């Protein structure tokens, strides 16, 4: 049985049988390609970096985000290790242009981040600082221990359990507030009353009903 | 009209030394990372962080 409207199936059977999109391409936990292009172009514009040196900065930013997370509240600068020297890049263009969130933007880097963590662990103990904060006691799960990791159908069940437990531990019982303090400050009404030299006082025009005795 | 340049200048000065504008000292703002918004002619935009706003 197919869904039918006015005596006609509302689905195209042939196209549907041929429709095989990638699961990560149609999920709403990852920024759309248009949003990613907008963010990338905005960061290029803000950094004043050409299209040839930009991927190196992207590599550095991906490694930094593996280490330190992708929270909306991150600020200051991030750092690239140019040999033995430290280069500082402002974080404002990275965060203010990431829509809907920076985590959704960095989700595009999740497979590369996992591969990079595995590669680094091939040569030395390399657990991302996110996994050190989460107190993950398994070193073989280091490849999933970052906060912008995207769970897919190929993620191992144990890795999925570990990632969900880490997310639950990190989020705790945080409750979102829709509003801050309202920007309308004035609560009183403007005083439009005149003030002349005939007034008995700055606040009273006269003392009309007053009786001396 | 000077708000973006003022914010950039405050960040630049804070890169070399503790620099909180006297407005933020009068307001008793206890966060140094928010010094870049602690002046009275700062213009809030769609790119201003929620915490800064």
């Amino acid at each position: 049985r197919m869904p039918k409207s006015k005596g006609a199936t509302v689905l195209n059977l042939e196209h549907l049988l041929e429709y095989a999109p990638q699961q990560i391409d149609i999920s709403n936990t990852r920024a759309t390609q248009s949003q990613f292009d907008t963010w990338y172009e905005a960061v290029q514009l803000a950094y004043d970096i050409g299209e040839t040196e930009m991927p190196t900065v992207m590599n550095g930013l991906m490694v930094w985000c593996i280490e330190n997370g992708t929270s909306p509240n991150i600020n200051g600068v991030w750092v690239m290790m140019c040999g033995d020297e430290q280069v500082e890049y402002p974080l404002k263009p990275i965060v203010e242009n990431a829509k809907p969130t920076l985590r959704q933007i960095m989700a595009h880097f999740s497979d590369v981040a996992e591969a990079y963590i595995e590669m680094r662990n091939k040569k030395e103990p390399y657990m991302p600082r996110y996994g050190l904060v989460r107190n993950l006691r398994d070193g073989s799960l280091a490849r999933y221990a970052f906060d912008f990791y995207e769970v897919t159908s190929r993620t191992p069940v144990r890795a999925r359990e570990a990632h969900i437990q880490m997310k639950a531990a990190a989020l705790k019982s945080a409750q979102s507030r829709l509003f801050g303090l309202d920007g309308g400050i004035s609560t009183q009404e403007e005083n439009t009353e005149r003030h002349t030299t005939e007034d008995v006082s700055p606040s009273m025009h006269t003392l009309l009903g007053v009786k001396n005795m | 009209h000077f708000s973006d340049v003022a914010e950039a200048y405050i960040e630049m000065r804070n890169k070399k030394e503790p620099y909180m504008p006297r407005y933020g000292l009068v307001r008793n703002l206890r966060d140094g990372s928010l010094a870049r918004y602690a002046f009275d002619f700062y213009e809030v935009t769609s790119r201003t962080p929620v915490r800064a706003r």
Partner: peptide, 11 residues
């Protein structure tokens, strides 16, 4: 890698 200026003309 190039260094980013504090107050640039892009702003």
């Amino acid at each position: 890698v190039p260094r980013i200026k504090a107050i640039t003309s892009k702003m």
